[PDB]
Subunit: 267 residues, 4 copies
């Protein structure tokens, strides 16, 4: 079985990753926090809400890398830089989900991936990555015979429209169909719009309440319609995907991998 | 009741004949333009329900004695003469002609002072029911929900959102005391910021051959209530018009709409 | 403004009820716990996660009734029995959402409701109660011209099908249409079922994953369809409804009330 | 450009197929009916509601096969047998959508498919075949991590439950996951069902009104859900797929093909 270490194990996301490791039947290899954290010495399982599991929060990643085959890192881009060097010298694979890394930090990641296996993905949700593959496959088959509309819904606090996931989906469809998203995208409809251009990709964005996040793509043809939909119940399905990527990457050739590799979608 | 169909030759007329027979009523008459080719043919056979013993006439006045109520889905000029004739004969009329002139609509109100007249923006029973549900849900939820209107229609529709969506949004704004033109939003792009509670959002989907779907979302904290109307075809106006026709027979001469016909004004 | 007290303030539902009182802008009048609870003396606002609010947890309901105009009780039927007798003597209204009261305990409630105002509802979610009213109205208008199908979805751990909410919706429609649900209900379809009887009310129950709770009623006609749907994001929309009932019932005549009364649906 | 002939050109499906041939820009090569038909001599385009196109209904398939590269046959299994022998001797490919052929009649097809190209598919809707491929792919990735539920809706007259299309989808999913559908299928839920078995594939069948046909497969996981949905607006989307298969099969090696081949779904 693979030994998975969780970096930043004290934060909100770390605790979820600890539950995901134990729920997948894996051994928690390590739980690391900042060397000055209040929680050093606490039980990771107790802290994660699953009761004691015998792994305690430590503050030195280098001291626990021998106990791990892979580590999962959802922290700060600066902390990921230090985590990359330690895993390189120790030969431990790393699954990185840190958002907002600089172009220099992202380059440091790419060169590390020539020495250790590295997983880097924009989204670790298994369902989202699956959805994208379905969209690409349906788009290749439907070709120019369907009107493509992207509908998403989110809570009333979201400041951006459409969501990054909705745009990620439209981008994959536009790449598949050979269209330029900025040219063919439409974000509203009011008044005498005229009839619909087949090249148009329409984005309908719903805002309200506390909706966690729903995305639907409609391939609308003559006489029929195919919908691909992903709905999130909570903000926690990154963990199951990240843990699945960690188990998958153990013992593989040193390259940079994404969730398309992990899920066998590049076929 | 004996129900007559005006403009019985057209696409909508033929559907109305089916609706009368499908509702178990006796078709009292079937009238077409006085220069129509089909004058003399049997209405039932032409409508696809087999012979029923009523033939197409080009003279509405000659068969008014054979009817208790008549249904008119034609052109605004054709209804005006038909409205005048029904007044003198004392036969009720259900009018669904779109785009009636300001003088013709005033002629209707005076006609409704002599005979009962039904005039509604939409004769689909489901659409009218939904709008009542929207009003009822809106009054109870008040300002505790973010309201979003989603509709879908075929790729040939030139106007957005549909009249039905705006009719629904208008009903909600009136219940909530909002001005729809002030609070409506038809698209979202870029840094929209957080949602204003007063906003009523309209998301319009276009594609393929979708006949017509409308969903209103009352989105609160922890839960959501949706009212949805979906149309399979463009013929569900007929069942309502026939229902309005049977309802208006033998009633006091006023102007009625589908809220009266469906008993929707009786709950608040 | 009304002073609302929360019973069982240490439990999961009690803490949520404290948040709902503060989220609605009301002043928390009291917070009572089991007489053997550890938390007596701690601050309710802090204990509920909204920061200190100046109300401390007590173990004596009788000692704090003077500070409240109404109390909300989501506890056990045995504890509710003591709460019903105590609230009667103090003249404080009570909102009860305890499930599973005995036929004798429910009778104790009805006799109590002759002295103090009592709100008792099967479901305190505002959305659900609204949904049932939409169903009743749609059912009255459509009559026997539509096929009615009830679809619900819940997480994979739910042992009962259909949900109580779905049956509550189905029952409301059957009463409107004059049908006997036990006679006309259908819970599955397999093989040569034949054509559909118009009287049938069909129940499609979806089970999977962690779905909190979705309920859809379809009025399916010829050429069109009307759907009324309620979707739950979490298990907490009872609290806002209960708090709204608490504020609504303050100072009213002593009867038994439900959420139809609170929301003006009757 | 392929010359497509339509057999049974007088019937409901024949008229729809004529529309589909012209809507695709193809040449109507022939329009054939029974030699004793009333419609012999009528213009196929006029009969299909698209105005004259200059091809008239004939009663002899052998006399017009030289005008065709492929023919489309939605008739009776007895008539399809005769058309197979004629197309074989004439070397013209054929697309068959006739339902209910015997095990011997299906064998006549397989031996014919060694001489001429033959397309035979259970369902010619492009969207449905796309949907099935999407289900197989999602099922392979999710594996045993999701509860799978099939929801379908049809008009109040449908006598069979679930629909053949819903069963077809469950069969594709059960095959991908290594499950036996008859063992894991559940068609209703009433009373104390207990908690859900992960292996179960649940079928919820909706009946009412005049619904043409809706099918939804829910892959329900922990924290998220992915739905694949196909909706039919009318009973005519078989035609476009059959026409698309007709053009695809022209000039290909004599084998038996299905819509997975036509749409590039095999891999």
């Amino acid at each position: 079985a693979p030994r998975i270490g969780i970096l930043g194990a004290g934060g909100r996301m770390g605790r979820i990753l600890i539950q995901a490791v134990q729920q997948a039947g894996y051994q928690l290899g390590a739980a690391v926090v900042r060397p000055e954290s209040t929680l050093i010495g606490a039980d990771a399982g107790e802290l994660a809400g699953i009761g004691s599991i015998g792994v305690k929060l430590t503050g030195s990643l280098a001291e626990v890398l021998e106990d791990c085959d892979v580590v999962i890192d959802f922290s700060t881009p600066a902390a990921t830089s230090e985590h990359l060097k330690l895993c390189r010298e120790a030969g431990v694979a790393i699954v990185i989900g840190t958002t907002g890394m600089s172009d220099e930090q992202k380059a440091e990641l790419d060169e590390t991936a020539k020495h250790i296996p590295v997983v880097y993905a924009a989204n670790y949700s298994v369902g989202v990555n699956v959805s994208i593959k379905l969209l690409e496959l349906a788009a290749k088959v439907f070709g120019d015979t369907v009107d493509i509309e992207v509908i998403e819904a989110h809570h009333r606090h979201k400041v951006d429209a459409p969501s990054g996931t909705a745009l990620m989906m439209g981008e994959a469809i536009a790449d598949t169909l050979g269209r330029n998203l900025k040219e063919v995208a439409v974000y509203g409809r009011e008044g005498h719009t005229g009839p619909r251009d087949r090249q148009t990709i329409g984005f309908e964005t719903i805002r309200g309440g506390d909706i966690v996040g729903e995305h639907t793509v409609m391939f609308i043809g003559e006489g029929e319609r195919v919908e691909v939909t992903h709905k999130a119940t909570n903000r926690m399905n990154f963990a199951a995907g990240a843990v699945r990527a960690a188990a998958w990457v153990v013992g593989r050739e040193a390259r940079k991998y994404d969730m398309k590799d992990v899920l066998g979608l590049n076929d």
